[PDB]
Amino acid sequence: KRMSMVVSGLTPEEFMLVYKFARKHHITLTNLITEETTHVVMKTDAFVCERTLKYFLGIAGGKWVVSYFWVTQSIKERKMLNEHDFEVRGDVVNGRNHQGPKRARESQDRKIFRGLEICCYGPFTNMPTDQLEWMVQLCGASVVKELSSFTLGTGVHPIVVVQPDAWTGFHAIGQMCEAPVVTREWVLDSVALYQCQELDTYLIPQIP
């Protein structure tokens, strides 16, 4: 029942008129991305963006992920253009091709990490552990906190996600619990496409 938007991938300069725009038309504009937020406006080209945290969390949430062009061209006219003509279509995972954003809000009855359990293990760079955990949770996944917190129950698939990028051994994991060990980029890639890429190329070689 509420319109609430958040911005991603702009300069302070460009953010200004998203603010001026917000107040003009009575739209709530928030600092950080929440669960009420229904709109993610972000910078494109005429409509491709860079992958931001808010980007992944927008697609994950099934939100409207609309370009910044929506604001520039609705001021250039006079009225509020309807975002539907302005939703993003890619980044550099997907070209302007595999429009994930659309795919997500349309396929909510059918989440991607549906029958899976995910441990976000170890250090991560510019995406806090819990923030990622939430991105996963939105896409049907169940989050686990230790490696020894995986379910006996047979219907479930254990998957350990690590960002190796931020360490200094992590081919280790496999020994401790027996579940596939994948780079973070598998989560990231899966949301951006909203498709759930198979584990093959994201699998981390392990030491027996």
Binding site: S8, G9, T11, R51, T52, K54, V92, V93, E185
Partner: peptide, 10 residues
């Protein structure tokens, strides 16, 4: 400074 981005796939 600004918002973090995320580069290439796997």
């Amino acid at each position: 400074p600004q918002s973090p981005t995320f580069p290439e796939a796997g």
